[PDB]
Design a protein around this ligand. Structure first.
Ligand code: BCL
Ligand code: BCL
Ligand code: BCL
Ligand code: BCL
Ligand code: BCL
Ligand code: BCL
Ligand code: BCL
Ligand code: BCL
Ligand code: BCL
Ligand SMILES: CC(C)=CCC/C(C)=C/C=C/C(C)=C/C=C/C(C)=C/C=C/C=C(C)/C=C/C=C(C)/C=C/C1=C(C)C(=O)CCC1(C)C
Ligand SMILES: [Fe+3]
Lengths: 306, 38, 26, 49, 49, 300, 32, 47, 38, 49, 38, 38, 49, 38, 49, 38, 38, 38, 38, 49, 49
């Protein structure tokens, strides 16, 4: 009841554009596929595109205003310009001048709308083809972390100044300032949990890629066919991981592991960041009372001085 | 039927347990009752 | 005697490698 | 499941009835011990005041 | 009198040894000459007052 | 008849023999193709202990693990009296000592623990290479593990010798190597502004995103009637490009290696050649394309 | 010396980079 | 005095033991499923 | 049957054990009873 | 499973009954020793006070 | 049968060993008994 | 048979060795016996 | 398994009985030595006090 | 037979060598014998 | 396995008996050497005190 | 196709170019020749 | 035959070389013999 | 043929352009010629 | 015959080369000879 | 394997006996040299004191 | 393999005997050169003292 040909070559809204596919050439030789193909545009993806364009236009024009409209200073200082949120005075209020955080709020709102509509587009397109909707829920977890960073942490703290500043250099500064302002961010347990899950995700990705490429002579990369009858490549991979560490998985469970590692990373990061400001004002001072900080009576300080 | 009995039972029990923990924690952290050393 | 010992060792190395290379490639 | 009473035949197997019985007795004993411990703890040092 | 007839009798295999020797010698010579030049033309330490 | 599929599903009603796992293991288990079998002519340990394969590099690795664990627990329970793993403090010798070691002076057991850990890691890598050779496979897993092992080697061997004091090594303590990381990151202020650290962070984030997307893609077509082209049509409607079955695994492998490689390069460069990453970028505003183009607070 | 050993460690650090370039080259070449 | 506060107990150690036990259980169940018998291509003739 | 007997036993036992340990630790760290050296 | 009693036949094999018996005796001995140790420790120094 | 005998044995043995180690460690670290140098 | 003899022997020996090492380290680190230079 | 007594036939093989006997003797000897060592250590320095 | 002769020999030799090395290092680093310059 | 005694035939091969004998003699010699070394070390410097 | 001639030309040319550039930069930054404004 | 002669020779030679190296480095690093500049 | 003509042309042109740009920038930044306002 | 002559020759040559290199490096790094600028 | 003694026939081939003899002689010579070196080192500087 | 002596016939082929002779001669020459080098090095700068 689902035709794959009409899903790729319809016209107009609820259809595709760039319909005659292009070929890149070098991507075929290195990755195995080089067709760019048509792209879907119907309903969802129009609202998101328009809103993201509006937000980017606002940010770029406010960048232009900060240098006197000089295009050479623009190129010189493009990587360190930023539109900052309103200062700590009357922080949550929207009655701020356009150059003191007025341009930040509108761009943030449009970005919010863009990301929500993109999630909707993902959900509908996943449903329209017959595949499952796992990607939508993964993006939901990522959006949970994003919305904790941009909406729910500033609120419940009382000021918009707790959010990042819309710039290439302004996010690193935000991370450093947030780490400094709440004691020591290393001693936040949910930060440790998120680091655990992130490193596990990278390790699992590397292992899975290496294994599937090593056993690629017997066509182990066709995961959909391996989930019905297991050929020699999957058996060799299973035996390899059985003889090395004493236990192994199959061609189905490892993807569950990867999915849940990523989801746990996002969720624990969001929870830790939310608790950082509202419940525990000082993470080092809490770790000293929780007996997780090691005593350091007489440090050898000649290592840290030039 | 719109909803299975098992799903309703699971959702209700999880919501109840989460709420019980949340209100005990919130009542404890307020320090307005003098329970467990004030 | 830093230069003299280095010269002696290098000369020994060169003569030995010449001898063994001649033995192998013949 | 001939040992299970008439009411609980649709829910219980013959082997699970005995394990359920053991669990019920264990829970009752634990409840009695907990009640005694709570009474002694209150008599020692009240926690409400 | 060899245990490697495929390396010591074939012309191709006989050129392996000489090529490797020359490559090692040239690498060592390059490193030595560059660092000798650097340490011979570099200025003296900037003393204090 | 019901055939249990590998996914765990059973379907009513090809070489689909429902066979046990023992036959597969017995067919592929054959002796005599490891690395040491080519060098010495025989692998001294060519047997299986349970599920694990014990080669010439398994014994060295197990000795290293045992000695490392023993030396770690001795320093932290004895010589520190902590009795808890979250507050012990296993430090190297002081910077004043130089590159020489001394059993009488403190910091000796840190040296033994580090040496044993290095031996164990190298043995693990060689044993993986042996097991990969026994199965007629490729050498990619050893490449990735070698990347991470080189990341280990850079921090504890190359950097201290280049600096020349041997006190430039992170302590082996839980919640205390974080202390070393925090103090090293701030001594060379704005470790964010290190160009190679940013590349490592970018590749880490890309690795997580790629792994989660691949998991979602595979799990979404698990147990349905699909023509094997539905996932490509999904990945072409969204993002306007599909990479293929073999391309994704190569990307994952390459990115996972590259992130750690760039991170080790950044840490080594921060150790020796640069002292301040803020002064590194002082050349940007001085290139002869932007020098005299501004006025007031806008000129640099 | 101060600089010779540092350059040698730099060489060792780049030797780590080399093996993955080898895999990239193999993947590029072996396709045709 | 020597005891950690209640926050230190729960927020730090309940998640820790939970992670260890969940990992050790998930490994057991995944190994069980992977070692179970099901449709495989015959190794004697497939390769 | 909405729920297996085994799953009920497992969930209940795990919850009870965790709650017992948590309550014992929370009472011990309060210092309100004079148990184990005050 | 002929050595298993009539009641517990649906639950126990013939070889598991002996292991269960061994475990039961071990637990009983451990409980006796633990009671003795607790009484000795209390007589030495009360921990409640 | 809801549960294997071996599963019950393993779970009970591991729980008992862990509890014994934990209780010995907690009693030792309290400094309330004068055991092993006070 | 619920438990094979080999696993029983292996587990018992491993536990015994671990406990012996841990007990020796804990007693040595207490400094209450005057053993190996007090 | 003809050397195994009638009681433990469903549990023990014939070659495992000897290893079990050896293990039992080793455990008994170790317990005796441990008791002697503990008595000597107590006579040297009491640890409870 | 439960255990191969070769496995027993290998395990015993490895354990003995590890114990010997550990004991020598521990006695050497304690500074309680005046061996190898005090 | 005609050299293995009657008791240990189900456990020992004929070629492992000799190696087992060699290991036993080596262990006994090592034990006597260890006893002598410990006696000499105690006579030099007591470690218990 | 044989790789020895080709792999050699590329490596030799690259080494020569890199060494020449490095050596001119080292001599220029030493300030011991009075070249390009002292 | 439980063990090949080649395996025994390889293991013995490797152990001997490793231990000879270890003893030489440990004696050199102890600084108790006045060898190689004290 | 060891090398394509196209590769030689591309490499030579790229190297020449890069060297010309580098030489012009180094001569300009030296301040030794009084070109473009000293 | 237990050992091929080729294997013995290769192993002995590699061991000798590695030992010579290691001995040279260790004797250089000791700083006790005054060879190659002290 | 006719040159191997009667006792060690099941363990040794005819070509490994000679190599074993060579290894034994080498080990004995190494032991003698080690004893001489240890005596000389002790005469130079005692390590126990 | 008729050039090989009677004693070493089971171990050596005809073609490996000559290479073994070459290796032995090379080892002896290397030993002589190493002895003279060590004597000269000690004559320059003693390393024991
Ligand atoms: C946790 C939720 C539980 C659940 C808990 C209950 C409870 C509890 C009851 C029922 C009852 C019913 N449930 Mg049920 N039930 C669940 C799952 C199901 C499912 C399913 C999963 O498919 C179904 C089909 C049903 C169906 C039904 C009906 C058969 C039955 C009568 C409903 C009725 O007439 O409501 C029509 C009536 C109303 C909607 C009344 C609403 C009143 C509102 C909420 C105002 C209340 C005021 C308050 C009491 C006053 C407060 C004073 C304070 C002091 C301030 N339940 C889940 C598992 N169900 C009832 C029953 O059996 O009665 C005999 C009943 O009491
Ligand atoms: C702040 C002042 C008071 C206080 C004020 C109150 C008040 C007021 C109330 C409580 C309530 C309760 N408090 Mg309190 N509380 C205090 C201190 C304590 C202390 C303590 C350590 O001192 C404890 C242990 C408790 C504990 C309790 C519970 C007995 C009870 C909440 C139960 C619950 O979780 O419901 C939520 C639980 C669930 C939703 C599920 C529970 C488990 C179920 C029954 C098990 C089913 C198992 C089966 C297998 C499941 C099948 C489905 C599965 C999905 C497979 N309180 C102090 C002294 N407390 C409440 C009460 O009385 O409730 C009756 C209440 O209203
Ligand atoms: C603090 C004041 C006292 C003190 C007070 C007490 C009190 C009070 C008690 C103990 C108890 C014990 N103490 Mg204490 N104890 C003190 C100091 C010590 C010291 C020391 C170094 O100072 C030591 C070593 C011990 C040792 C011990 C043990 C003998 C015992 C706990 C056993 C156990 O682990 O049960 C937990 C172990 C298990 C559940 C499993 C054990 C292993 C099984 C038997 C092995 C089977 C192997 C087979 C292969 C398994 C099959 C299944 C497998 C999964 C395959 N005590 C001080 C002096 N001690 C307890 C006791 O007497 O127990 C009887 C007790 O109640
Ligand atoms: C000096 C006094 C020190 C001390 C220093 C040491 C040192 C140092 C060592 C021991 C070792 C041991 N100590 Mg002590 N020990 C002390 C106090 C004690 C106390 C005590 C309660 O006071 C006890 C119970 C022990 C008990 C023990 C044993 C565990 C062990 C010796 C017996 C053994 O297993 O022999 C069995 C041993 C063997 C059968 C080995 C046989 C080896 C054969 C002879 C070959 C040797 C190698 C050979 C020369 C190599 C070259 C030839 C080629 C192989 C061909 N020690 C004090 C604190 N102890 C030794 C040990 O073996 O630890 C594992 C050890 O290394
Ligand atoms: C690395 C070790 C070498 C090796 C080195 C030796 C050496 C060395 C000897 C033998 C000898 C024997 N070896 Mg062999 N052998 C090896 C491999 C093998 C293999 C095999 C792999 O299949 C086998 C089957 C054998 C078998 C045997 C027998 C044929 C023979 C006599 C054993 C005996 O009666 O012991 C029974 C005797 C004992 C167990 C003696 C135990 C002594 C204990 C350890 C005490 C020693 C104290 C010490 C000498 C003095 C201390 C003095 C200090 C100054 C304080 N060897 C490996 C490759 N073998 C012996 C031989 O041929 O003699 C003519 C011999 O001397
Ligand atoms: C100023 C005095 C300085 C010094 C400054 C330099 C500088 C500067 C350089 C050298 C270089 C070298 N120095 Mg000098 N050098 C000094 C002292 C020494 C001492 C010594 C013991 O005193 C020694 C042994 C050396 C040794 C060497 C050689 C390694 C090398 C020159 C030979 C060579 O390889 O030519 C082989 C070279 C070639 C075959 C190149 C041929 C190139 C062809 C002709 C094309 C050139 C480019 C062309 C013009 C481009 C445009 C056209 C397009 C291609 C179409 N120098 C002192 C300290 N030395 C030079 C070198 O070659 O470095 C790599 C170099 O650049
Ligand atoms: C980027 C460089 C260009 C290129 C630039 C040139 C130039 C320029 C010339 C040639 C010439 C030749 N090239 Mg073409 N050539 C290219 C690519 C190729 C390729 C190919 C890709 O397959 C091939 C096969 C060739 C092959 C050839 C020959 C057909 C021809 C004669 C060579 C000869 O006899 O040299 C033998 C002679 C030499 C090698 C001379 C070496 C001289 C050395 C470097 C010393 C120079 C002294 C210096 C000038 C003195 C300076 C004085 C100052 C005042 C200090 N070229 C590349 C792409 N080629 C020549 C030609 O056709 O002449 C009619 C010629 O002039
Ligand atoms: C002013 C004196 C300065 C100095 C300034 C410069 C500058 C500035 C440059 C050089 C360049 C060079 N210098 Mg000078 N140089 C100095 C001292 C030296 C010394 C010395 C030891 O003293 C040496 C050996 C050199 C050597 C060299 C050569 C490497 C090179 C010139 C030859 C060449 O390769 O031509 C081969 C070059 C060509 C064949 C180029 C041909 C280009 C054609 C005509 C097209 C040009 C572009 C065209 C106009 C674009 C528009 C039209 C469209 C194409 C349609 N210089 C001093 C310090 N030198 C030049 C160079 O080429 O660097 C890479 C350069 O730019
Ligand atoms: C300087 C005084 C130092 C010290 C320094 C050293 C050093 C340094 C070493 C030893 C070694 C050993 N020491 Mg000591 N040792 C000291 C005190 C002790 C004490 C003690 C309680 O006081 C003891 C028990 C020991 C015991 C031991 C033995 C384990 C061993 C020597 C015997 C052996 O097995 O030879 C068996 C060894 C052989 C049979 C080797 C035979 C080698 C043949 C001859 C070939 C040699 C290489 C050859 C020349 C290469 C070139 C030619 C080509 C092969 C063709 N030492 C003091 C503290 N000792 C040595 C050893 O071998 O350790 C493993 C060693 O290296
Ligand atoms: C300030 C704070 C912290 C406030 C918190 C407020 C809250 C929210 C409190 C929450 C309280 C709760 C939720 C308590 C929970 C109590 C429970 C669930 C106990 C379970 C007992 C389970 C029991 C007894 C199970 C026993 C199992 C048994 C006997 C097993 C039996 C057996 C089984 C089943 C077998 O096959 C074979 C083995 C065997 C025969 C022994
Ligand atoms: Fe996959």
């Amino acid at each position: 009841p689902i035709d794959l040909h009409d899903e790729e070559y319809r016209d107009g809204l609820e259809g595709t554009i760039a319909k005659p596919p292009g070929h890149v050439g070098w991507m075929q030789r290195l990755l195995g596929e080089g067709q760019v193909g048509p792209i879907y545009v119907g309903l969802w993806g129009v609202i998101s595109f328009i809103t993201f364009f509006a937000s980017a236009f606002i940010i770029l024009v406010d960048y232009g205003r900060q240098v006197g409209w000089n295009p050479i200073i623009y190129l010189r200082e493009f990587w360190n310009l930023a539109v900052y949120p309103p200062p700590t005075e009357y922080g949550l209020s929207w009655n701020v001048p356009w150059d003191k955080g007025g341009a930040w709020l509108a761009a943030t709102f449009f970005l919010h709308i863009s990301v929500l509509t993109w999630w909707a587009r993902l959900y509908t397109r996943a449903k329209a083809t017959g595949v499952g909707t796992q990607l939508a829920w993964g993006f939901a977890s990522a959006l949970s972390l994003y919305f904790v960073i941009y909406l729910f942490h500033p609120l419940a703290l009382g000021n918009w100044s707790a959010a990042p500043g819309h710039g290439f250099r302004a996010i690193l500064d935000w991370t450093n300032y947030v780490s400094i302002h709440w004691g020591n961010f290393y001693y936040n347990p949910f930060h440790m949990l998120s680091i655990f899950f992130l490193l596990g995700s990278t390790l699992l990705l590397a292992m899975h890629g290496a294994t599937i490429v090593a056993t690629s002579k017997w066509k182990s990369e066709m995961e959909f066919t391996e989930m019905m009858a297991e050929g020699p490549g999957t058996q060799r991979a299973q035996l390899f991981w059985r003889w090395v560490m004493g236990w192994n998985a199959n061609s189905y469970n490892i993807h569950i592991w990867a999915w849940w590692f990523a989801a746990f990373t996002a969720i624990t990061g969001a929870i830790g960041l939310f608790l950082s400001g509202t419940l525990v004002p000082d993470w080092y001072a809490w770790g000293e009372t929780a007996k997780i900080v090691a005593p350091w009576p007489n440090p050898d300080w000649a290592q840290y001085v030039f | 039927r719109p909803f299975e009995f098992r799903t309703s039972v699971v959702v209700s029990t999880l919501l109840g347990l989460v709420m019980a923990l949340l209100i005990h924690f919130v009542v404890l952290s307020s320090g307005a009752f003098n329970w467990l050393r004030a | 005697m830093a230069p003299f010992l280095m010269a002696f060792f290098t000369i020994v190395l060169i003569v030995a490698t010449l001898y063994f290379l001649s033995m192998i490639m013949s | 499941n001939d040992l299970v009473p008439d009411q609980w035949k649709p829910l219980f197997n013959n082997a699970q009835w005995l394990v359920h019985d053991i669990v019920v007795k264990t829970i009752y004993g634990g409840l009695i011990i907990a009640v005694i411990a709570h009474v002694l703890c209150w008599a020692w040092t009240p926690w409400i005041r | 009198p060899t245990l490697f007839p495929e390396i010591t009798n074939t012309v191709r295999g006989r050129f392996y040894i000489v090529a490797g020797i020359i490559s090692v010698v040239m690498a060592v010579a390059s490193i030595a000459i560059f660092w000798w030049i650097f340490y011979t033309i570099t200025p003296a330490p900037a003393p204090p007052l | 008849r019901a055939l249990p599929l590998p996914s765990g599903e059973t379907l009513p009603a090809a070489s689909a023999e429902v066979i046990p796992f023992s036959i597969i293991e017995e067919f592929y288990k054959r002796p005599g193709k490891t690395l040491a079998a080519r060098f010495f002519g025989v692998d001294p340990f060519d047997f299986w202990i349970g599920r694990f394969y014990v080669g010439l590099f398994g014994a060295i690795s197990i000795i290293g693990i045992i000695l490392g664990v023993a030396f770690y627990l001795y320093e932290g329970v004895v010589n520190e009296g902590t009795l808890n793993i979250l507050a012990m403090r296993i430090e190297p010798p002081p910077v004043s000592q130089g590159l020489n070691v001394d059993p009488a002076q403190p910091g000796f057991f840190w040296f033994l623990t580090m040496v044993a850990a290095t031996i164990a890691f190298v043995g693990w890598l060689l044993r993986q290479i042996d097991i990969s050779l026994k199965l007629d496979m490729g050498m990619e897993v050893p490449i990735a593990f070698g990347a991470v092992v080189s990341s280990w080697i850079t921090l504890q061997w190359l950097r201290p010798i280049a600096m020349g004091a041997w006190g430039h090594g992170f302590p082996l303590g839980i919640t205390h190597h974080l202390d070393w990381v925090s103090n090293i990151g701030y001594q060379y202020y704005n470790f964010f502004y290190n160009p190679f650290h940013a590349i490592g962070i970018t590749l880490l984030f890309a690795s997580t995103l790629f792994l989660h997307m691949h998991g979602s893609a595979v799990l979404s077509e698990a147990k349905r009637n699909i023509s094997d082209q539905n996932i490509h049509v999904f990945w072409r409607n969204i993002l306007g490009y599909s990479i293929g079955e073999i391309g994704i695994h190569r990307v994952a492998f390459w990115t996972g290696a590259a992130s750690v490689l760039f991170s080790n390069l950044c840490i080594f460069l921060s150790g020796t050649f640069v002292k301040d990453w803020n002064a590194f970028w002082g050349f940007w505003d001085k290139m002869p394309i932007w020098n005299g183009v501004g006025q007031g607070a806008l000129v640099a | 010396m101060n600089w010779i050993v540092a350059t040698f460690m730099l060489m060792f650090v780049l030797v780590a980079f080399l093996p993955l370039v080898v895999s990239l080259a193999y993947t590029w070449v072996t396709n045709p | 005095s020597p005891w950690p506060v209640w926050s230190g107990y729960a927020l730090c150690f309940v998640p820790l033991a939970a992670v260890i036990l969940g990992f050790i259980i998930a490994a057991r169940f995944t190994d069980k499923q992977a070692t179970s018998a099901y449709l495989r291509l015959d190794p004697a003739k497939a390769n």
